[PDB]
Subunit: 215 residues, 2 copies
Amino acid sequence: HVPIPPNDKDTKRLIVVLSNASLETYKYTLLNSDEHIGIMRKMNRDISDARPDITHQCLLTLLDSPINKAGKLQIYIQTAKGVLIEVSPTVRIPRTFKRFAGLMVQLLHRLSIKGTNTNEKLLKVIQNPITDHLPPNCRKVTLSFDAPLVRVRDYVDTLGPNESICVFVGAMAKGPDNFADAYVDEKISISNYSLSASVACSKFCHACEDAWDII
Amino acid sequence: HVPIPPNDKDTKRLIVVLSNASLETYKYTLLNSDEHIGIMRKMNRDISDARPDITHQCLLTLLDSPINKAGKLQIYIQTAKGVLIEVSPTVRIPRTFKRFAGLMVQLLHRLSIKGTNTNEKLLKVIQNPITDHLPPNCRKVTLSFDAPLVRVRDYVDTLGPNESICVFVGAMAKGPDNFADAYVDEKISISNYSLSASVACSKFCHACEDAWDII
């Protein structure tokens, strides 16, 4: 089986963009709420933001999803440093947050994680903006709260088989929906209650398993 | 809204039992692969088993699932020490593995986590076996690999509205399906590829959202 290459702009695919991520290597390790609680809580700036266990579990759940087993997923990470990261469908990850953390540190160091067997890279820090790396047949959407209710399976049911979709999922700290307004075609809501990025990506990706017939 | 009490044996409900868990407080903290890699790898016994990030993310995903928002979930944990733990639908959890780890340590210490506001307990270590705590209208099943393919929505579609289901999900180390043969009525498989406990519980619970009409 071969996943989606960058040569392919024909397959109806799901690009998941985790926007406004918190990948800031400080002193080398990442900024987490485990040990930097004294320096964030001491230096009085919005504790609230040392995120990456949620993008960790989005990477675990989405890269363990059956949409990865069909290969129809393509996931990007937009951070606060302006760094946009292309995460492979074929990369494997350790299940632990510490090795993921130092692996993101060396990803920010040498800007590339190569495969231990293959010639090709796996985690590739790439250019801003996202529209250089999105397909032309794209659906730039965003999960939101002020948006009215839109059912996912009816929505991608109203998407055609040539027309790929790029979702904007917020694993951010605390922010409104103006994080992506330069590149939003549509903002949708899927439930009345508050939902996280992990269960949001899981309900969306399993719903488009139900609407793309991945068995 | 009121969740399922232990008085209620009438509601068609999903009991998720995470069987063969690894909750062993050593020296106080739990046995994890982060810091005990030197003593497991040094003392040459099946590294392979310091699990609990998977039951952590099953607790996050299942206790953040919309089946919890309907209250039709009831989740138990069976460990290697013979400890069986009743996890509430109404308990909230910190999102971090360290506070979850020490919280499980004090759960094994005083055998109960009380609510910080309510009178009733939230995490209640209870008796072996599970059949004292399962409903009479029960469906003791188990996810497996040697079992033939069974579609979930057709299966619980063939379950009747008086008939609750108790699934056995393996977050174990490495083991066959004889972990539960004293209490198995049926073993099913949902996909040909290898699936984890997190995506297994998410596909099953979202599938019975599709078959129980939780909107």
